[PDB]
Amino acid sequence: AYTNSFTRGVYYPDKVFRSSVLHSTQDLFLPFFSNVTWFHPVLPFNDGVYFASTEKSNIIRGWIFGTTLDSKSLLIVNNATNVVIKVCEFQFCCTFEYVSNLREFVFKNIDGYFKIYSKHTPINLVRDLPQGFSALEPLVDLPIGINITRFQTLLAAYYVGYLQPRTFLLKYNENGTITDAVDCALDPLSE
């Protein structure tokens, strides 16, 4: 299935506070009103990925990353109440070890660092992602230094979109939360 990612996928590009300003920044973002694939499987990791999950009992927990993805790569898993990230060549059907409604994540691999942004917001809907805007604050920066060309989830439907290098115009309010944005290449009015 497919659905429309109205305005979601915007994340704080910097860890610096701002307020009541329209700041322009170019980076890998999820283009507005994009066709995001809806899964009710292995996927590429071209230049970053936006993942989204709607859950009632938290069925989806894990992610697998890598090129071949079988004992030759990253693994992430949420065991009960403990996020666990490893880079061992696991056996699925070590040089790193880390241990800690709608949920949205952004995964990026820049200069060997794996950046994971993640937001959370309550919603009452069962069809697709609700129309609205919100920002995905950063949560993890990981020094993996590991090649990435594919990923696969581990589990409750989910949504997958891909990032492109697009300039955006973020609107920081008085309190420092991104309340609106403008894709600089969506349409002539946006330009």
Partner: protein, 149 residues
């Protein structure tokens, strides 16, 4: 001759910055598929250094350590041996917050910093507010009075 130290001699493409490749896949230097079998035009990508004490200084072993750190954009945990000082408000002072240095007046702020944000910024990209490293309070920075004469 110490052969415990290795280096990768062949690879289909150059490494991206800070990328780490520990694969041992056989490199096919020719048109014949290797299928994991070493031989002519099928080479093990690694090769050992020849380290003997009589080797020339160019061939002698050197140990290398590269320290990589990203400068001030967020809270910090690695600092130098510099000591600290008490804090005074409502007076023009020279402040040094976690290596970010400047001059101005520090006042109590009403800004709501996020846990991952160290210091704010002004429209002119000059710092506007900071998080005190010892007390979790947000200080607003205002340049102290000036004007023509």
């Amino acid at each position: 001759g110490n052969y415990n130290y290795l280096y990768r001699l062949f690879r289909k493409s150059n490494l991206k910055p800070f990328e780490r490749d520990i694969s041992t896949e056989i490199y096919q230097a020719g048109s014949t598929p290797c299928n994991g079998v070493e031989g002519f035009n099928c080479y093990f990508p690694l090769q050992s250094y020849g380290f003997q004490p009589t080797n020339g200084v160019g061939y002698q072993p050197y140990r290398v350590v590269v320290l990589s750190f990203e400068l001030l954009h967020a809270p910090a945990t690695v600092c130098g041996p510099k000591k600290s000082t008490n804090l005074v408000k409502n007076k023009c002072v020279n402040f040094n917050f976690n290596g970010l240095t400047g001059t101005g007046v520090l006042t109590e702020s009403n800004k709501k910093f996020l846990p991952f944000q160290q210091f704010g910024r002004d429209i002119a990209d000059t710092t506007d507010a900071v998080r005190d490293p010892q007390t979790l309070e947000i200080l607003d920075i205002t340049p102290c009075s000036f004007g023509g004469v």
